[PDB]
Each structure stands twice: as structure tokens, then as C-alpha cells.
Design an enzyme around this catalytic site. Structure first.
Site, PDB file in Angstrom:
ATOM      1  CG  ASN A 263      -1.207  -1.461  -2.849  1.00 23.35           C
ATOM      2  OD1 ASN A 263      -1.898  -1.636  -1.850  1.00 23.35           O
ATOM      3  ND2 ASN A 263      -0.490  -0.355  -3.042  1.00 23.35           N
TER       4      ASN A 263
ATOM      5  NE  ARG B 131      -1.306   4.034   8.037  1.00 19.84           N
ATOM      6  CZ  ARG B 131      -1.697   3.391   6.942  1.00 19.84           C
ATOM      7  NH1 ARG B 131      -0.959   2.396   6.461  1.00 19.84           N
ATOM      8  NH2 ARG B 131      -2.824   3.765   6.320  1.00 19.84           N
TER       9      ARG B 131
ATOM     10  CG  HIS C  20       2.571  -5.194   0.598  1.00 18.49           C
ATOM     11  ND1 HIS C  20       3.201  -5.319  -0.622  1.00 18.49           N
ATOM     12  CD2 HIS C  20       1.821  -6.314   0.750  1.00 18.49           C
ATOM     13  CE1 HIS C  20       2.845  -6.462  -1.185  1.00 18.49           C
ATOM     14  NE2 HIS C  20       2.008  -7.083  -0.373  1.00 18.49           N
TER      15      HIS C  20
END
Lengths: 315, 316, 316, 315
Positions: free
Chosen positions: D121, D152, D176
Site C-alpha cells: 500500500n 467481502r 482503497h
């Protein structure tokens, strides 16, 4: 002494599909298998063959053969392929209704709590015949056809788009023959409508129509090519995928012949529809918002089944 | 697939075993498959059926049919089941199958000479020799499937008696086909523990073991008898594919099979069923067991059988 | 799931091993999972992570967390890793872990008394005894995981030396924890063929074997040393889950583990690591090997260790 | 002597995700594994642990550890998790750009023909950073994020509809944080639009919105709950599923961070989009017909990435 017993699946019919479903159980260690058939020797030969494969697969399930229904006692799932395959599949009705009724008596007596998957043609009609004769709950009886039809529909689309069939959602509903209904409008690539791909020229409307037609003719093409018999590899896996979804309470969307009490405006009959198979058997029957044109095509499939059931009742 | 291509296995012979090996490739997504056969029509039908199964298995391999050797080009493994199954004794098939095996050898030699080859055609040991001689392939890249199947039977029977999974029964058969095949009773173990310890503890009798050894030899014939037509194919297909996978994934698995001897067991320039290790180098090890004088005598009978068949092979 | 319900496994202890066993259940769609722990927060986090993995694996099992024993009701198998890993010698953990194991035993006795129980908590053999005594469960339904992991190490080391897959290396460790664990050199086989034959053919020396036996004993400590914090969990989790699966699917696999003795090896009323067969009847067979006088002497050292720890256990 | 060599995957970063991806390779016998990290001892401890698991799984792959890039020579796939996980993920930029550039030099020198999957990240920005520094072809570099986000999204929908996530097609695209874009309109149940299920009251619009929000907050929830570290089980499987699709030329639809040269009107940047991964690496980038409202949400995701890349260039 055994606290945790293995699942048990009885294959009523030990022909190519039956022996192959037995093989799948061995490879996946899915359940003990009983290869049942009113044939001498052959079922035992296949049980020995399948049983011997457990060693190479390093799995352990028991594969036995039988010719008396008491041997299917305690089965969790029963998969029926018994019956004639040739003499139109509609013409099989008289001969196979008698066989299916005998199987229903065997299941009703020895394993009435089983989940039953019928494969015998004419499918939708034979599933109704089994349900009526056996007395089993409507959620525990279904017929395998549309999973196989959809497998073909998906493979053809996957080939054209160069995408794995895992990511192609294509469903066929309805009955057998040219009236089966490959739902072109509901074909998706990971949920993305096929129409977007057509717009991008990844597939033409003409190719789609060709694929829809090919899906209808697929089983007959294999029959023509094999020269004897019919498909068994995809059919066997189609039925075992439905059986595993039940045994492991997976809750998989698998189109299959299910009992209707209002869905699609249908009553007292079985026909191929999108369904969810889980530990409760047929847990959901999905009613799609079919357009007027789709309903018209579906009505023809429905009429074909109604006509056969009419003839079935006349027996 | 510009960078990483799928492995490819050509099934030379698309009968029950060939179509079923194709099915295994689909289930395990092991490799693309070519169902080859001189007979046209039927292979294409089986290819359609096997390819359609990829959708339900949620796998993606290509399954196609062919009747031209050009189509087996690029094959990593070739599994040969082509050949007559009965004379229009397996020893008698020699003339007819040697011709077919030689044609296959020509096809492989030209189109996929770097393939690992698993012969299944009877009389097995003699046909492996025939293929090796005609193809000119490296000795470590040619073998025959028989003993893995014979051992699967030996193991299943023992497993049933001891109430233990066959995963944990190590039992091996070596030698050639027929009553001369040699189930090695002394080398049977339960997770490495000698079967003799189990017999001594009463879990099995010597009589039962002798029965199991005999059933192992008669197993193939029993299935032939019971099916009424043809022979076993589910276990044979898995036996061959297990050997193919050991090569493709360089697993280094001990799988008894017909292998080229260059001194092992005192044998030279011939193939015979022996314990071997199959990995990315093909037949990586030929295991030489310390056979007792009695076992050597039994083994010598298989040797004699193969040597005699090979003499006739040469005389062609 | 009104007719066919999924199997269920409760992980009593949701540390690295517990969360990883949950992961294995997701990958294999083996069973619904309950990640139990007295610590709140972390188990729920791992349950979310493991449940989310079902989507990618395309499987469907339920993964939830809990800190109340009522939530383990209905469990087919209970795998216990709860317990201190260091004193605030594993033998010294006795006081602290016996209390925890007794609490777990109370929970199982009340909420899922028909479960098959796999203890992992150290000192293992003593804790299995502690759990059995406190829970009152049938002797065939209680065991401890240690030797399958010890054997996995023994096998991997041998596999590396011989250049053969560990699938084909049968190597077994029995006994208790520590330097007293007993890697059975004499019973190592390559697909049933004695390792001695390979040593005689020069594929391995007796010195290398002795080295491998010692590395097997020191393996756990080496990983502890190298990780810097905690201990191994990938192989331990797979060892325990393999034992659980053998029970759930009635596989009848030979998996050495801590089992109750009622005469085997002359031992009574105690648990110790021995080769055993695990099937739907729990521990279905306790294999009694014909140990040499020398092996018996080594084994006696493990016996003495367990007997002494159990004396202290009783003295609580 | 070896004619058929095993595939090889180098895990650059041997933390929880790296060690777990190594475990998956062992379980599936997918490839030999190199657990690389500039950490002493720990990577070797995990390699011993994972290696020892091959025995119980009855598989055979080699798992080793390394700290010098020459050891990743010949890797078919490289999965990068190296870098800081905490000090906003945007804030990680300065520290991780340096680490990613070092990894890029190692890959460029020793395994430039590998397929590279970045996990570090801030993801979309780090993938661009790796691509620029390494010089690899645009089809051979991508970032893992959206497969995990979608996992998810799918699990939550599957729970609500009582259907296996296998049959739930739900995709998240974008970057993100709260700007990630769970595409509610493209959620399907075996290709059947979720809107039909909502109409049947199987799920409310409110529940759907809750699920969309939960998908965005999912990673942070796990962080909060674990107390230390972040998710690794689903992330590891997400990355390995992308690696296997490449290695076995599966042609799977897996949303991931890919290079754009016109798609969605984007240029010279990587962002999470639906893509097809096969033996040619990123073989297709699917451009969805986003509605005006969806485009507006997507633009925010795009702007977030552009801002980070602006800062990246300023380095």
C-alpha cells in the site's frame, strides 16, 4: 461403533453415467457408492473398477454393486439413470414410467428420507412420475438436465470470449429438445451483461444465436458422433455437483427440474428452473422477470411438459 | 497464453481409457487434451462431452479430437492405448499391435519428440520396447503403465481386510502381465510397518494374504468377465494420469511401471515392470530391491516371458 | 439445512494454529468453524478474514467467533490449542494449563459430549490425560496431536535426501515431547521398501540418517528460534486438521498421535504418542509395533516422562 | 536432466500474507516457493514450517527462504507484500516507494520475465511505481486489492441471500478506502440481477447500502479487531488466485489494479478494474458501461490515485 458415518449415494442405473458418478465420488471422496442395476455382472465389474481407483486417488470410500433395493437403505442421495435411452425422447414415456415407478417403490420403502435426483428421460415428466409414485416431499425430488444444458451454453460462450467458464454465468431453463430455453438476456461475464460485450463487438448477435442453437442441439451432436450411446462425462458431473450441493449444504444455484406451486404461474408439475440446492434439498426456486418474448418461448417448453404429463396420467 | 502455456497431453487412442484420462485432466485442470484416434467421429463426441465438463468443474482446459499426428505437436506427455484388444492371449496381439505402436512411434518421433511417453497397449512390456526402438526417444522418457494398476488392486484388497485407507497401504506388484505378475507380499506395509506384524497380531492370516495375492493377479480378468464387454478403465485411466502428473509437476513419486533396464536386476536393453521414481526428468530412479532367492525365481519367470516376446518382436 | 447439515469443528484457542485450522476448513469446505477464545476481539477479526476467504475459494462454510462454550454445542470435532505457551520447560506449564484444560473439558462435557477431541496444548500427553479425566469422554474419542507433525518433519528431511515426494516416504515418530520423542529409524520406508535398502545402495548414509533423526527432534525448537516469536503453525494446523478429517470422513488413516493405552506396549490408563488408525469410530486401532530391545529402552524414557508428569497432574 | 520443471513463485515479503501464500502453494502443489525478506531468521522459520506441511498434504514443492535477489532468478510469478503497513495508507507513500523501487531493481535484474502482483500500500500508486522502476511490460504488472474487496462484498451478499458466494458475482473497482467502488448495479446471482431479488424483498435497498458500506470498512474492522496487524487469510488467497490464473492460463475475471491507456478515459496510471488474467498476464481490461452516477463515484477514486501519483512523481 462408528460415530461419524460417510455419506452414501445410490446410483440406480449403472450404465455410463452411473459408473462415472461413482468414479467422481471416489475421486472427491464424496460418499460411499452403491452401483445398482438389474443387470448381472456389469455393475459388479464397475464397482470393482471404481473401488480400485480409490487406491490411486488415495481416498477411502466403499463402492459396491447391488440388484435388490434393500441395499440402498440409508442412502442420503439417490441418482436415477435407469430406463431406456432409445426406442423421440417423448416416445420413451410408456417404458420409462414403468421403470421409474418401480424405482419409486424401492426408494419409498428403503430410503424415503433421501434427496432424489432423476436423470431418466423424458426428464421433466419422469421427475413428476417419480414424485407422484414415491410420496417424497417436493423439496427432496428434482431432475438433472439444465445444469448440463447450461454447461454447454457456458462452454460455447467461454470459447468465444476467451474467458474461463467459471466466469460465464449462462442458464438454460425449460424442458428438453428445441424448446429448452437458453436465456441469452441473462448471460453474464462475472455479473457484467453479455450485451455490453456484444456492443464492444466481442461477440455478435449472430454468434450468440448460433450458440443458443448449438446448446439445444449439443446432446444430439454427441449422440451422432459417438455412434452408440450418449454423453456421460458432463452429465455425471452435473448430477454429482447437485448431489454435493445437497450433501454439503452448499446452497448452489443450479437450474434443475423442480416442483412448481405458483412459480412462473405453474402448478402441479416439474420443469427446469433456476433453483438453490442445499441441505434442505431444493431451498429456493428463483422466479425470473421474464420479458413477454421470453415468456412466449417458455410457454412452449411448459406446453411440451404438460402434454407429456397428460399422457402420463392417461396411463 | 503468450508467457505461461498450459501443459498438453495427447491420448493416442480415444477408447474408454483415453476418454476417461481426458476427463481426469478436466477435473484437475491438469492439461489441455487431444483425443487422438484413427477412428473419426467418436473422438470428437468424447471431446465435446469432456470439454463441456470444464464448465461444471469450473476449470479451463481445451479438449479437442484429432486423427492427424500433426495435432499432437507440442504435447508434454503422450499416453498410448491404441491397439487391438483381441485377435481378429495378449502375447498373440504382438504382430498387430507392434505395427500400430510403430506408427505411433513415427508420429511422436516427428511431432513431439521431447514428450514423456506412457504406453498402455498390450502386450505391455514388449510394446514399450517396440515403441522405444521405433521412436528413438531417450530411455528415461518412455515407460509403460501396468503395475500401478496391479498395485492399486493389491492395496485395495489389503485395505479392505485391515480396515485402513489404501493411502496407508504400500503394496507393490512388479513383473509382466498375467499370472507371472509378481505381487511382493514381503514388501507390503501399513505406513511402513511390515504386514507380517499385522498377521502376527491376527489382523490377517497368511491364507488371506495368499488369497489377496491371487486375487490381484486375477483382478483384470474378473472385471473383463463381469463387464461382459471390454475391460477396466476407471482405475487404469487414473493410474496412467497419476504417472503423467508426477512427470508434469516433477513430483518424484514412486510408481511401479515398465522401465528400461541398464543393469538393474541384471537386466539389459529391455523394459519390465519395476518400482521407479517419476519426476520432471522422466524415470528418475529405477529401484533395485534386495529380492530373496524365492522372489528372484518368480521374477525370473516374468523376465523370461518378456525376453521371449521381445525375441519375436525383433523377428519382425 | 433441514436434512443434511455441515460438519462443525470448534477451535478452542484462536491463536495462529486455531486461525489456520479454520483457514484449512474454508479451503477444503471441510466444516463450519467456531473460533473460540477467552480473548475477545481478535477471534472475531480472524473469523471475518477466514469467512471472507470462502468467496475466493468458491466454498461455503460458516466461520464465526465465540467466547462462550454454549457456542461449541453441536461440534463434531473440537481442537484445543488453548493454554499458556510459556511460564508467566513445557513440563512446568502443567499447573497453568491443567486448569485451562479442565475448564475446556467442562465446556465440552456439557455442550458437545459426543465430539471427537484433539488436544494440542502442552505438555501434550499429560494434557490429553487431564482432558480425558476431566471430561469423562470415551477413551476412543480423545487424542493429542504431536507425532503427525514430528513425522511430517522426519518425512520431509528423508524426502529431500532421497529426492522422492514425502507422499512416498513412510516415517513415524512415537513417544512424548522433547529429545525423548522417538523417530523410528528402522520403520522408515520408501513405498514400503525399507530405508536400509536405500542406504545399502548408497542413496543415504547411516550418518545422514542419524543426522535426520536428530534434526527431527530439534525441528520445533529451530522454528521457534528462527521466528523469534511464537512457534510453528502451518504444519501443526494441517496435522490436526488431517486427524480431524480422518474422523469426519471415516477415512481410517494411520496417523501417530497421543492415544489411550489399555495394555498396548504394556501401558495402562495413560496417553502417549503411538501409531493409530483414525476413522469414524475415533481412535479405531492402536498399533502395537514389535519394538527391538533397544527401541523399547528409548521408548521407556518417553513412558517414564509421561508417567512422572501424570503423577504431578494427579497431585493437583 | 529435468525436462518438466515446476513453476516458481517468489514472495517478496515474508510476513503473514507472504507465509500464507507459501502455505497455499504447498496445499495446492502450485509451485516451488521462495520466501524472501530482508529479515534474519523469520523467513527461514516460515519456510521450514511451510516445507514441513508438504508431507501432511502429500504434495511436493520446495519452500526455501532468501534475502538476496539472485535467489528469485527464474521466478514465474513475483508477489510483493514488502513495505510498511502503518506509520492513512496514503501516508505510506514516501517509505514504500523506496522499498518498491528496490524490489523493482531486483526483479528487473533477476526475473524480468515474471508476472508481478503487487500488494504493498498505497496499492494503485505502488503498482505504478513498480511498473515505472522495473521497465516490465504493462500486461505483466498488476496489483491485488479488488479481488479481496469483492470477496467481502460477495460474502456479505451471500450471507443475506443464503446462497454460496460461488454464485454471487459482485465486483468492487477503484482504489482503497471509502472511495473504492462496490458496483451494486452489477451484482448478480448466477447472472440474475440483484435488483430482481430486491424487488422480491429478498434484500432491501437499505441492506444493500449497508453491505456496500461494510465492504469499504471491512479491512479496517479486521485491523481494529485483531489489535495488531491486518487481514492475511483472504488477502493471501486473493493474490494466489490471481497467480494461478496466470500460471495455468485460466483466463479468470479478477478485478485488479491494471495499467490504463484509454480504458475509462484513463491514461498512464494503474487503478482497480475488472480484468481477465491468463497466461499472457492481463489479457483483457473490461470497460463497463458505467452510468453517470457511477462515473461520478469512480472519478473520486481516480482523483485519489492521480493525487498520490502526483506526489510520487514529486519524489
Amino acid at each position: 461403533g462408528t460415530v461419524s458415518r460417510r455419506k452414501k449415494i445410490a446410483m440406480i442405473g449403472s450404465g455410463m453415467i452411473g459408473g462415472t458418478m461413482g468414479y467422481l465420488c471416489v475421486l472427491r471422496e464424496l460418499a460411499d457408492v452403491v452401483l445398482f442395476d438389474v443387470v448381472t455382472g456389469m455393475p459388479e465389474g464397475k464397482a470393482l473398477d471404481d473401488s480400485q481407483a480409490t487406491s490411486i486417488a488415495d481416498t477411502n470410500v466403499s463402492v459396491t454393486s447391488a440388484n435388490q433395493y434393500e441395499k440402498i437403505a440409508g442412502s442420503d442421495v439417490v441418482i436415477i439413470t435407469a430406463g431406456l435411452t432409445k426406442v423421440s425422447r417423448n416416445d420413451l414415456l410408456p417404458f420409462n414410467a414403468k421403470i421409474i415407478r418401480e424405482v419409486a417403490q424401492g426408494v419409498k420403502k428403503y430410503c424415503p428420507l433421501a434427496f432424489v435426483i432423476v436423470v431418466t428421460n423424458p426428464l421433466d415428466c419422469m421427475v413428476k412420475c417419480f414424485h407422484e409414485a414415491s410420496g417424497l416431499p417436493k423439496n427432496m425430488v428434482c431432475g438433472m438436465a439444465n445444469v448440463l444444458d447450461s454447461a454447454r451454453f457456458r462452454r460455447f460462450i467461454a470459447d468465444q470470449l476467451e474467458i474461463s467458464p467459471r466466469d460465464i454465468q449462462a442458464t438454460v431453463i425449460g424442458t428438453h429438445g428445441d424448446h429448452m430455453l437458453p436465456l441469452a438476456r441473462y448471460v453474464t461475464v462475472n455479473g457484467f451483461p453479455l450485451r455490453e460485450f456484444i456492443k464492444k463487438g466481442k461477440m455478435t448477435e449472430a454468434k450468440l444465436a448460433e450458440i443458443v442453437e448449438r446448446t439445444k442441439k449439443a446432446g444430439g451432436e454427441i449422440v451422432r458422433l459417438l455412434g452408440q450411446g450418449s454423453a456421460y462425462y458432463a452429465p455425471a458431473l452435473s448430477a454429482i455437483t447437485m448431489a454435493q450441493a445437497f450433501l454439503k449444504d452448499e446452497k448452489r444455484v443450479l437450474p434443475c427440474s423442480v416442483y412448481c406451486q405458483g412459480e412462473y404461474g405453474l402448478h402441479d408439475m416439474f420443469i427446469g428452473l433456476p433453483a438453490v440446492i442445499g441441505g434442505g434439498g431444493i431451498e429456493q426456486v428463483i422466479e425470473l422477470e421474464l420479458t413477454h418474448e421470453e415468456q412466449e418461448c417458455f410457454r412452449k417448453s411448459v406446453d411440451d411438459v404438460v402434454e407429456l404429463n397428460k399422457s402420463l396420467a392417461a396411463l
